[PDB]
């Protein structure tokens, strides 16, 4: 329904800039780092896989975690708690059938009590001031998807894949807007599967070019190459599945030729 595609797309753009976390928050977190976070996000990928949650719910949670850690110091022993309430909030917001709390407590190997997950849910709700409908990479990719000729599911999945990979590493993906990560990912997928490139229509629509997308595409290209050797592997496993057309098994291109 192009009736509102444009008004929505503009709105998501207004908003992505207001829901943005602050880029250098890890430097101020005395007791945590990007690897632990990466360990947390990696772990939420399986929890999502285990409960069969949407990718969308996945992205929302990580938006919540980054925003929650932008202004609150957390002891590592509490990282998983923060991440566990973020994922229950994303679930509640996005899912038809959200997993009940007892199960969220269940997958932490009873590391935290129900009371604590509920308390932490409130704390996050307060720090985010209930601002939960944040744009994410997923929400941008679906739109860009409409610009294919013809559609190509291998490409979709591969984009999704590259987007979801970018959740893993605050550094450097925190500095890129979600709509930019999605451009980078769409182009890299497309180029990879068919060799086509960022379509002129998406230039009209978004205002981004390969030129504007280069900086983020350069990081992502590396991530795609280094993927098989990355400490974290839940996403690569996930995308081996038929459900995503086995795109994790595809060979990245050695050069983009930008």
């Amino acid at each position: 329904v192009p009736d509102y595609h444009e008004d929505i797309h503009t709105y998501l753009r207004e908003m992505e800039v207001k829901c943005k976390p602050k880029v250098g928050y890890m430097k101020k977190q005395p007791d945590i780092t990007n690897s632990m976070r990466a360990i947390l996000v990696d772990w939420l990928v399986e929890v999502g896989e285990e409960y069969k949650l949407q990718n969308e719910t996945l992205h929302l949670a990580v938006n919540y975690i980054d925003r929650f850690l932008s202004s609150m110091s957390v002891l590592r022993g509490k990282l998983q708690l923060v991440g566990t309430a973020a994922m229950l909030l994303a679930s509640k917001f996005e899912e038809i059938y959200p997993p009940e709390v007892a199960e969220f407590v269940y997958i932490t190997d009873d590391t935290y009590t129900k009371k604590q997950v509920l308390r932490m849910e409130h704390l996050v709700l307060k720090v985010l001031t209930f601002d939960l409908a944040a744009p994410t990479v997923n929400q941008f990719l679906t739109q860009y998807f409409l610009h294919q000729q013809p559609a190509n599911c291998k490409v979709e999945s591969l984009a999704m894949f590259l987007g979801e990979l970018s959740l893993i590493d605050a550094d450097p993906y925190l500095k890129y807007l979600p709509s930019v990560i999605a451009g980078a990912a769409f182009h890299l997928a497309l180029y990879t599967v068919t060799g086509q490139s960022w379509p002129e229509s998406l230039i009209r629509k978004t205002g981004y070019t390969l030129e504007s997308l280069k900086p983020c595409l350069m990081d992502l290209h590396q991530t795609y190459l280094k993927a098989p050797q990355h400490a974290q592997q839940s996403i690569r496993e996930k995308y081996k599945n038929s459900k995503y057309h086995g795109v994790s098994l595809l060979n990245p291109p050695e050069t983009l030729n930008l």
Partner: peptide
């Protein structure tokens, strides 16, 4: 399953 686990960071 693999999903459930206490995340250790120390």
């Amino acid at each position: 399953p693999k999903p459930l686990k206490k995340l250790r960071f120390d």
